[PDB]
Amino acid sequence: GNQRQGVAFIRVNGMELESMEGASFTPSGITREEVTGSRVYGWKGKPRAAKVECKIPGGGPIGLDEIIDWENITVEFQADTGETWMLANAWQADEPKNDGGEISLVLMAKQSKRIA
Amino acid sequence: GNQRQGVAFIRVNGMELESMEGASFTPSGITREEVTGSRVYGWKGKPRAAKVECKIPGGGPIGLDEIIDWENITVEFQADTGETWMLANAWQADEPKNDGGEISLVLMAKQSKRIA
Amino acid sequence: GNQRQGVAFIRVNGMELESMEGASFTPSGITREEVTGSRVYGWKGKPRAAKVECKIPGGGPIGLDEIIDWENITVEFQADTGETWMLANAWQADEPKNDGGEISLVLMAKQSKRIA
Amino acid sequence: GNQRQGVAFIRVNGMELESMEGASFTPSGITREEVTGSRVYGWKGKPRAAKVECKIPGGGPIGLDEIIDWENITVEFQADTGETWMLANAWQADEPKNDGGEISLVLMAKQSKRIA
Amino acid sequence: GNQRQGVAFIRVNGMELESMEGASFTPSGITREEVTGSRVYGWKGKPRAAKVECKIPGGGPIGLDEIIDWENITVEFQADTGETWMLANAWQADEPKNDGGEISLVLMAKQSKRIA
Amino acid sequence: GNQRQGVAFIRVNGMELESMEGASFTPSGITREEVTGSRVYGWKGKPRAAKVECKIPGGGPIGLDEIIDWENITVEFQADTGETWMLANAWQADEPKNDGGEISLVLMAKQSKRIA
Amino acid sequence: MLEETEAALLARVRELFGATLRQVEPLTGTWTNEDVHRLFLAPPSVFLAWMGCGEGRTRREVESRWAFFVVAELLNGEPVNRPGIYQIVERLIAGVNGQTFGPTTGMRLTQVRNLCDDNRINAGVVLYGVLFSGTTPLPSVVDLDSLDDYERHWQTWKFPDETPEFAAHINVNQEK
Amino acid sequence: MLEETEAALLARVRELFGATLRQVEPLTGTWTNEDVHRLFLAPPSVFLAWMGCGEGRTRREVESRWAFFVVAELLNGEPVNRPGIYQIVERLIAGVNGQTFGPTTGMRLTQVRNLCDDNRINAGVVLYGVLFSGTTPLPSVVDLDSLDDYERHWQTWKFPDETPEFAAHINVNQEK
Amino acid sequence: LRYSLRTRITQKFPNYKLASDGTRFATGQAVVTPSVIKTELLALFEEWENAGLVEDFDTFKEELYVARNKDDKDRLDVLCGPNLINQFRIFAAQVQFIL
């Protein structure tokens, strides 16, 4: 109780990635857009891939080469409240830009399972 | 009197979702665009779906898996003044991004009735 | 019996530092903050770094260069009443300045442990 | 007859905290604010959490670690005139600091009830 | 330890270019976008060229003519922590705009090697 | 024995400047700052310029024009206890003003050397 | 807790100085214009005098103001041992600064008054006087202890005086 | 470290003024209303008097307040050498400003009082008085030195008094 | 009320040991200071206040007087205002029409 989540831990193969202020998560599932004509006509389904965004301060143990060479890893998004999602067979997307000592990073996977 | 609305309670199946500062409502009806030729020529009708945009602090009783698994729910947007709209057979839309400890969420339904 | 804190001793590497007054210790922990929405929900956490700020005479045996080159030291804040805290691997923050024989040291560390 | 407030007692878990001067109590409720447009209309509500600001001597029998580990406590603000308020499941806010044998505690709670 | 990157040195043929507050690096490799159909269906590969974006104060030893006439150089992005990438056979891109005494400049190459 | 800093002497080009009270010296180095994310990680560096803030009586033999034309000088901050610092190729910062027979000089240099 | 603090200061002074100071003795009142002709000075010696106490931070602590009046002899306008008296003053300041003495803690030096006027110069006495302030707490409420076997609970309902009385004499621990 | 400081100021005054000042001598106590009829003035001369020490920045330093009482002669309502006395006061201020004097450093001028009421005018003396404040440190803790061979370690477990004793007489450096 | 309070006192506090209010009794030790009995009586008053029958509560708290029998021992002298509830019997209403 009274433990509203405000801080999150990123973990990659049990390494507890150093994440900065802004950590974001989107669980995998179905994106539910609109299909409306004359009437509202319900909704329409669309697949969605699980995506976790985190900024890493540079110079840490991980480095940037290991980031760019990540193709098959198991990542975990743990919430201080206890919300712990798991992503199997993940991979880093977009460009890992190293701006101002910060490593902008996004990790994406095809399945998100809430464990514990 | 002197009860101008500043805070709104969102409820799903009688659970009173934990909502944050920004809660938005758009009742279902007709979106009234214009068709104008040489003269103004009145307006044109277009259907609209009821929409409730709310931000939920993470780690609460509601969770995020229950959010992404909502396909058929009954929503109730109650205003502190007393205006209480109701949506039957709703569904979560867009991506429920878990950014910065906040669960951005939008709930959409094909009908909105002003009850009480 | 119910003795209160009087003087506070600031030590670096097991050696006393001359502190004038108001040498403040802030423990390492979480800064619980409000989460206000439709109603009051609870509190949100945010990690902190333990921090000792103390004022030292300039030109002393300690020297200004040794102060500005303190990348890794082991600070200890000891209350004369008996309780003492130790900073694990602290470093000098802020911008040191020798203004009128006065220097302010903000030694900040990842964690503070209540030893002894 | 028309007695006024003198000293205020701040208790946690049924035990006094030595509050030096000017202990502050803000009740939990709604913070009504003006709503001005074409003309003045009324007032707008916004939920608020109860707050107690008390200053404690440092190094006391209470200790600093026990203070900074107060996630769930039951605070009581008692006015010597007779009226007292109790905080339901209060927690320590702000950033505690033991400056010069002095610590400031902002014990913030979801609700305050006028018991006794 | 405790050496999170905040400042980086850019070097061009052993010149240590004068950099500004924000320096950005993107190592060469493969950009991993989405290839999503009915299911997530994994990801898709795409080549990426290594890029270093930096701002230079005008009037330095380097000058702007030498900037605009750089066609075959080997640059080195060194981190204060120690992460030292090198780009062989580099070339400057975009418009070296001389705005407000600052040289907005970007240098990119086809290979990025992390040396030492 | 344990002598402490008393009066501080400000010299330019091997000539004393009449500094009234509280002459301030900030050494050149790195201004370490906290790096807070999911948890506290370490410290972040940032280059800093050495700075001497002194106050000179107006209308003196030094003259205001000679002060405002100090593009390249060699400042020396000498503590009476013995330690002295020299500014290699310092220049006048800030906006000099001869208000009330008083002028403030902020002489800033790339780095300060612990000579003598 | 003041007398304990006073005893602690006296013991500390005795340990620090020993035979250097001829005697140490708490002095009633502050130094007046008659104390020189009234006391058994026996210089060199120091007297610890409580100068009261101002309001502390809390309602359970005060800022006690103590004083160390140092005495010596100035025969023929010459201090008996000027290095000795200066060393005594400095060592008394150093050993009784910051360090706790019983319940009182944070002894802070406040003033060192010369306090050597004609009344003492003509009497062959220097009276360098140190002053101190300390955060001393107040005694706690005296505890209690008693055990009586609970056996009877007399309750009376407060009806009007001449209304027939209503009461219950429970007399607990009764079995039947 | 006050006595060393006052010796430093006296030596500095002697070096600066030499034979211009007839004598220099420390003064016991601040200048009262009878010092004129009690001292061997022999004007012109200057007296260094310690006026005490206010609280310093730390618990190891204090702000010592010294005073320079300058004396001369005013025969027939006329100073003996007004340029001389003004130069004496001025050079005393200049040469004892900022410069360190032993442990004390940062000598800052604080006040200069004319300090010539009727008592000194009818006594034919001017008493221009300078004041100074300096950051003087307190003496350090006295060191120690001793070397005794460690041979025995006697430990006694604190059991109840009449409970049979438990102890270990270790006696290190024993070989067998 | 007498029945309920007799039951409560005879069940909740058998073989206990009363003590002065300032006593340093442990958490589990069977000790009932006057303050403990006062708080228990107020809680019990609330227990038969939820189910009516005692109307006011504040005046009961102020007028409640639980003391140790200074003469002799082993007797809590308890003086409590009954604060009994009243029954809605007669309704009196004046219309005073304003027209």
Residue numbers in the entry:
A (entry chain d), B (entry chain c), C (entry chain a), D (entry chain X), E (entry chain S), F (entry chain T): 3 to 118
G (entry chain F), H (entry chain A): 1 to 176
I (entry chain Q): 396 to 494
Copied sentences from the primary study:
Myophage Mu is a representative of contractile nanomachines with a simple tail baseplate. The structure of extended Mu can be divided into four distinct regions: the DNA-containing head, the connector complex, the tail, and the baseplate.
The absence of baseplate density in the contracted tail indicates that the baseplate may have detached during the process of tail contraction, potentially due to the effects of excessive urea induction. However, the sheath protein gp39 undergoes significant conformational changes in both states. A structural comparison of the extended and contracted sheath monomers reveals that the N- and C-terminal arms of gp39 undergo significant conformational changes, indicating that each gp39 monomer primarily undergoes a rigid-body rotation, mediated by its N- and C-terminal arms, upon contraction. The outer diameter of the sheath ring increases from 195 Å to 260 Å, and the inner pore diameter expands from 79 Å to 92 Å, which is sufficient to break the contacts between the tail sheath and tube.
